[PDB]
Structure formats: C-alpha cells, structure tokens
C-alpha cells in the first residue's frame, strides 16, 4: 500500500459546453483549433467563456460598452461572449465595432445606425485570429437576484 | 474468408458470476445481484466465497466482442442487411436473426457466399 495523505484532484472547470446548439459546437471546434495552434491567451479565454453557462455570461449593455470605449479605446474591437443589450438611457451611441455571441435587435439597429459594425465570433476569428487590438468585456456577474439573496 | 490477424484472445474468466444462494433457492435466478446486506460474506469478500464482478475482469480492447474465429458478430435480417458487410468480410461475420424464414435464409447464405462473408448459423433450417 501507498500512504496518500493528499488526494489527486479531478478537474473543477468545464471542458465542453453543456449546450446542444450545433452552431455553438462549430464555434467551439474553431476556437479549440485556435487555442491549440496559437500563443494568444485571448483565444483560450474566449474558448473557456464559450464553455460557460448563462449565469456565467451576464449581458453587456451599450452604455457599459461606451464607458469602456473611453480613454484611448475608441478604435479597439469590443469582444463580448454574452448578449449585447440596448440601453435607452444612453441617448447617443458612439461609433463602435462589436463582436458578440448575439445581439438584441435594438442593440444591433442602434450600432448600425451610429455607424459601427456588428460581428459574430467566427467573423472575429477571421479578422483578428490573435485577438489583436481587442477590448474584452464581461457583464456584471453579481447583479442577480439569487446572488443578492445569497 | 479468414479473419484479420489479431493478438491472441485471452479470457480472464470463463465461468459465470452466480448469484449468492441461488443454488439453494429456486425462486432465485442465477443472474448476478450485488448483495447489499451489511453482514454478507460475499459482499465483504471473505475467502472461499463467490467472486464479485468488477472492471478488472474486463477484456482486451483489441479483442473485445471477438468470436473465437476472430470475427465480430453482426445481426442480419435480409440480403440488403448482409450486403453492409461487403467491405468487412475479414472483421465481421453475419448472424442471421432467429425469426427469418428458410427461403430468406437461403438467399442470405447465397449472397454471403458470393461476398465471402462468414455466416455463424448457416446450417440452420436446412
């Protein structure tokens, strides 16, 4: 016998999505290839967040994007691996280039009306395969009723 | 035709795993049941008792589901079923299903002879 005071630890992170979305499966295959064949940490972060569940992908609004676009970030490509929502409190949308998992209809319309560009994550992989000149944004994770009641 | 060359087929255990006390009770089938009593000698693995099945008895991955000739059985119901084994005559043999009539068995056996596919139960209904 071998005395094992310590225990070998099985993985406590997602290795694959629980979702059955076929397009998400194709995106996961593409970003698995990118994370394997590139040095860019952006690709690994994007792959890991593609694995994530919905409460771990809180929505990001246009006002949050506009806040993070200030101070030299106006020309960077905004990357969100959640839903980009519209904020009607923001009356003037700045010109921006946003790549997201999905957009609401009003957010897409307001970005295109302000003159920015809307992309999917496979288009982001085509144009910035190393994540160059990107601004990676996450939504407020703790802004949930369950988290308030914890 | 002869099977594809393979490593020797080793069975770690050929005897079945008999259920405890099914030799003494006729209402107990011999099919294996794990004893869940806290004081059971088979469950506690006292020596001289029945063995318990476990994953250590598992067969070699290269020879799993191989019959002694080296083929893997594939159940067939008709000629179109047996024609799926056209590219696999060195690895797969055809087992005609039990509810196939004698004439259809004759047709299946003739087609499998043309394809060079071994039939495991070719002598039946003759």
């Amino acid at each position: 016998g071998i005395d094992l005071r310590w225990k070998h630890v099985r993985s406590s992170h997602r290795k694959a999505p629980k979702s059955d979305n076929v397009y998400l499966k194709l995106l996961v295959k593409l970003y698995r290839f990118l994370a394997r064949r590139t040095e860019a940490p952006f690709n690994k972060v994007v792959l890991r967040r593609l694995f994530m569940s919905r409460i771990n992908r809180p929505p990001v609004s246009l006002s949050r994007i506009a806040r993070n676009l200030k101070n030299g970030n106006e020309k960077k490509t905004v990357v969100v691996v959640a839903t980009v929502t519209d904020d009607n409190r923001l009356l003037q949308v700045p010109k921006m280039e946003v790549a997201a998992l999905r957009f609401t209809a009003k957010a897409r319309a307001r970005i295109e009306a302000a003159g920015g560009r809307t992309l999917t994550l496979d288009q982001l992989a085509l144009e910035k395969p190393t994540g160059a000149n990107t601004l990676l944004l996450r939504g407020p994770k703790n802004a949930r009723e369950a988290v308030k009641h914890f | 035709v002869a099977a594809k060359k393979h490593v020797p087929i080793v069975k770690k255990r050929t005897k079945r795993f008999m259920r405890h006390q099914s030799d003494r009770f006729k209402c107990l089938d011999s099919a294996w049941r794990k004893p869940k009593g806290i004081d059971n000698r088979v469950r506690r693995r006292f020596k001289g008792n029945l063995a318990m099945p476990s994953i250590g008895y598992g067969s070699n991955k290269k020879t799993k589901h191989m019959m002694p000739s080296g083929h893997k059985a594939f159940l067939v119901h008709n000629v179109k079923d047996v024609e799926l084994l056209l590219m696999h005559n060195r690895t797969y043999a055809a087992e005609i299903a039990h509810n196939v009539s004698s004439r259809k068995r004759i047709d299946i056996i003739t087609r499998a002879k043309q394809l060079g596919v071994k039939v495991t139960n070719a002598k039946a209904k003759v």
Binding site: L30, R37, R102, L121, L126 | -
Partner: protein, 52 residues
Amino acid sequence: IKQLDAVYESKKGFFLPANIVSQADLSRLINSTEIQSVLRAPKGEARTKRAC
C-alpha cells in the same frame, strides 16, 4: 412560395432570428489564409512514435 414572405412579415412580435455563426463552413474558416498565416508551426503529428 410567393405568400411565404408576407406570412413571415405579418407575424407581430417575431423576427427571423440572427444566428450566432455567420459562416457555417468550418473547413473554409480553418483553412483560410487569414487564420493559417498566423498559426504556430505544428508541434507533432496525428500519430506519435513510441519513445521507449
């Protein structure tokens, strides 16, 4: 087939959904010049020789 577009225009509260993927051809995406020109060189093959 003429009336189908008006049928889907008349459904109020519903729009045809946007996909999360713009190009479904994964082979075209992976073997495009844009991705392949920035990749690291391969670190191995599909089959690995047994060392010892």
